[PDB]
């Protein structure tokens, strides 16, 4: 019936999350200026793989692998999940 | 002890008791410590 939260995991130093970092350094703020009541939790770690977890209504959750993604591919996947509302 | 009586004390028994095992006056073990964990007493008045 609708998404409720977005969770984006990354690493500080690894290159595989680097493009994901290139999203956060560029286009995150306008995202928080676009959906102010939608919590997009950014979680940094040390050696984890890039990932994108979305929670929907009644506990439904989907997973997207953001491994070795560039900034524009991350933007495409994230606009897909916010515009999905499955 | 008719010539070497024992030393008189204030706590030494004046009546020797034999083995009372099997009698109603036998020994029963029990814990000598009080309750360890206390319990929360619910209030005596309703929440209305």
């Amino acid at each position: 019936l609708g998404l409720r939260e977005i969770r984006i995991h990354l690493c500080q130093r690894s290159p595989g999350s680097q493009g994901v970092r290139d999203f956060i350094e560029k286009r995150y703020v306008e995202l928080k200026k676009a959906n102010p009541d939608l919590p997009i939790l950014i979680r940094e770690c040390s050696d984890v793989q890039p990932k994108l977890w979305a929670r929907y209504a009644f506990g439904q959750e989907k997973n997207v692998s953001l491994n070795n993604f560039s900034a524009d591919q991350v933007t495409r996947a994230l606009e897909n999940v916010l515009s999905s509302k499955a | 002890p008719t010539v070497k009586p024992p030393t008189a004390r204030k706590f030494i028994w004046t009546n020797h008791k034999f083995n009372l095992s099997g009698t109603p006056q036998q020994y029963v073990p029990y814990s000598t410590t009080r309750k360890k964990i206390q319990e929360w007493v619910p209030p005596s008045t309703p929440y209305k």
Partner: protein, 688 residues
């Protein structure tokens, strides 16, 4: 290379200049006996136990106070070293009283241990020993001054770390007594740590006195939850009963010290417990019942509610496992109304980035700074070990401390800027020279307490301090890896709740009134039944029945922090795990087990049944909660600064008054301390 080579027992080793003999002997893995030396206190050099012999030198030197030089050979097992050790031991045991059976230090006494290891086996003292008059220095530290050896760790601890300057050495010669010369009640936030550093039984723990013996106690390591520092502690237990709490050697947080609340919370931990589930009967009184009946009633009321009609409140002593279990259970019913007792501003970035709700540098990062600004906090009571670290940096690294708020005592000297919030507008503009002071600072630090955010202008204060921090960092010549902005939390479960996606503050509950409310240890009494409608199925899930239990409709007993393997995150974002010391009393069970069984009754069971699977779910939500003893850097300060400038609030004229001012308010913080007769005795003793 400036390092020099010295010799111990014919073996070469490479040490730094300025390194004493004892540090080199510890570098080669040996322990020279000592009584007055301490690795965290200044060198006194008076016990004379550490005497060793340098070869080709006919005088013994004190290994705790003699710097080494190149070419020195140290003989730690020669004849004259053993003779000196035996003589010093005989002199120490000459006037020591025969009190070993009735002394709590027995079994862990330094004097007995090194008397067996290095002393002789008989006493030649045929005279009459001395007798020292006892003293009464408080209701926590039992004092018997006859057993003291004048090691003067009391004096250095009171003058250097606690900084109270009350203890002293009165008199001359063998009649000199370690005391205060008057009936002075020595009370401080770090008093009980002197019981750690007394090598003899002169100072003992008064609640622990004549209760146990160290050889029959099992030690279980755990984490403190009373404060948000995350103190690594150990619990000594005896036959399934919690006896005493000691610190642990963790150099990054609580090096070997703890606060008095952690040291004496166990008496409250063993009183006023909840041992059996209770439900309201027809008369409205709380009456005992079975687990299945209470769970069935809660599930039956839960299945009717949907949407915003159900909400939950997280307490200050609830682990992340129960938090994620309740979050997923309330997400099974499609309810995001998850609230915490402590209020944090969600304006702008909010809880998304981890940079704006963590102590971003380190607890130990204060050792690296030179200018520290405190805004609206009293760290002497909210986080005593953080204030101890600040005092250590102020003593050794010549740190500069300035505080905004009421001029409280912080056991050192600082710069009191003021109490109105408008002073931040004087700093963010550049009117006062203190702005230039942090501009010229190489490693500046801005610390904002979480008690100031409890006011109605927390967003404005956070925006002002973030503006100050990002004005300093983007203009001054800072390295970049240095994190200026820091937020000090005073609730153990606050960081774990914020990392889990909870909504801080109770605003979402008073906005839309829920018909069924969870109280996961909501002992603060943040919302009364008046703010809620006429019929609410309030369910309390906690160990101590303090505030929410008399108003709850169903009471579910839980496990305390010593009775479950629990994940807690301190104020700096470091995850830690507690261990099981004892069992919950009666029918009380672990909290996540209760939530999972409730979902199994309700027909919305979660896909985990064991604790490691709960930790796997925690890793799925956020990995930082499952990698223990590791601190992850919280980046992206500029994005949070840009998001904080979108909406601007107005700072009010209310002075930044912390809720704690004196030592009286320090002992009354949580539900565990509210059931402690030791803390009641401390409050009574400090209020006279």
């Amino acid at each position: 290379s400036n390092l020099i080579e010295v010799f111990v027992d014919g073996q070469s080793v490479m040490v730094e200049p300025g390194t004493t003999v004892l540090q080199a002997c510890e570098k080669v893995g040996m322990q020279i006996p000592r009584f007055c030396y301490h690795e965290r206190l200044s060198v006194a050099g008076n016990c004379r136990m550490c005497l060793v012999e340098i070869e080709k030198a006919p005088k013994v030197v004190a290994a705790c106070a003699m710097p080494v030089m190149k070419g020195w050979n140290i003989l730690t097992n020669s004849e004259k070293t053993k003779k000196a050790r035996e003589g010093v031991m005989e002199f120490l045991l000459a006037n020591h009283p025969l009190d070993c059976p009735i002394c709590d230090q027995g079994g862990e006494c330094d004097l007995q241990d090194q008397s067996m290891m290095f002393g002789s086996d008989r006493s030649r003292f045929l005279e009459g020993k001395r007798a020292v008059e006892d003293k009464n220095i408080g209701p926590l530290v039992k004092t018997i001054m006859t057993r003291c050896i004048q090691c003067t760790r009391c004096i250095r601890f009171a003058s250097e770390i606690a900084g109270v300057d009350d203890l002293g050495t009165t008199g001359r010669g063998n009649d000199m007594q370690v005391g205060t010369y008057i009936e002075k009640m020595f009370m401080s936030e770090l008093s009980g740590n002197i019981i750690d550093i007394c090598p003899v039984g002169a100072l003992t723990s008064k609640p622990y006195a004549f209760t146990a013996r160290p050889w029959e106690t099992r030690k279980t390591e755990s984490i403190d939850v009373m404060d948000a520092v995350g103190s690594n502690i150990v619990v000594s237990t005896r036959t399934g009963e919690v006896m005493r709490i000691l610190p642990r050697m963790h150099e990054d947080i609580n090096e070997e010290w703890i606060s008095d609340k952690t040291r004496f919370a166990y008496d409250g931990l063993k009183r006023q417990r909840l041992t059996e589930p209770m439900v309201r009967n027809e008369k409205g009184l709380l009456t005992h019942t079975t687990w299945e009946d209470a769970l069935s009633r809660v599930a039956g009321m839960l299945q009717s509610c949907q949407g915003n009609d159900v909400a939950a409140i997280a307490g200050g002593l609830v682990d992340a496992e129960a938090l994620i279990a309740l979050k997923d259970l309330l997400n099974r019913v499609d309810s995001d109304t998850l609230c915490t007792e402590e209020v944090f501003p969600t304006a702008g970035a909010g809880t998304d980035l981890r940079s704006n709700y963590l102590l971003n540098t380190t607890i130990a990062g204060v050792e690296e700074a030179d200018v520290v600004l405190l805004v609206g906090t009293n760290p002497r009571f909210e986080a005593p070990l953080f204030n101890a670290r600040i005092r250590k940096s102020w003593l050794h690294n010549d740190l500069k401390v300035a505080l905004i708020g009421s001029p409280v005592d912080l056991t050192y000297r600082y710069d009191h800027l003021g109490d109105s919030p408008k002073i931040l507008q004087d700093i963010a503009s550049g009117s006062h020279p203190f702005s230039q002071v942090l501009q010229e600072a190489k490693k500046p630090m801005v610390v904002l307490g979480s008690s100031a955010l409890q006011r109605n202008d927390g967003a404005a204060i956070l925006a002002a301090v973030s503006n100050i921090a990002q004005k300093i960092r983007t203009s001054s010549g800072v390295t970049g890896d240095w994190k200026v902005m820091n937020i000090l939390h005073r609730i153990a479960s606050q960081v774990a709740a914020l990392d889990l996606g909870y909504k801080p503050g109770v605003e979402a509950i008073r906005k839309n009134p829920p018909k069924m409310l969870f109280l996961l240890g909501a002992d603060g009494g943040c919302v009364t039944r008046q703010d809620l409608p006429k019929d609410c199925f309030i369910v309390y899930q906690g160990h101590h029945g303090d505030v929410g239990a008399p108003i709850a409709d169903v009471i579910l007993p839980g496990a305390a922090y010593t009775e479950k393997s629990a994940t807690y995150v301190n104020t700096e974002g470091r995850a830690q795990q507690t261990k099981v010391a004892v069992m919950p009393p009666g029918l009380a069970r672990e909290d996540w087990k209760i939530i999972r069984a409730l979902s199994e009754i309700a027909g919305m069971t979660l896909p985990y049944d064991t604790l490691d699977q709960v930790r796997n779910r925690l890793e799925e939500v956020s990995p930082n909660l499952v990698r223990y003893d590791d601190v992850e850097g919280a980046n992206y300060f500029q994005q949070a600064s840009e998001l904080s400038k979108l909406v601007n609030q107005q700072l009010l004229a209310d002075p930044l008054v912390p809720p704690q001012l004196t030592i009286k308010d320090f002992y009354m913080t949580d539900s565990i301390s509210r059931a402690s007769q030791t803390m009641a005795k401390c409050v009574k003793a400090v209020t006279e």
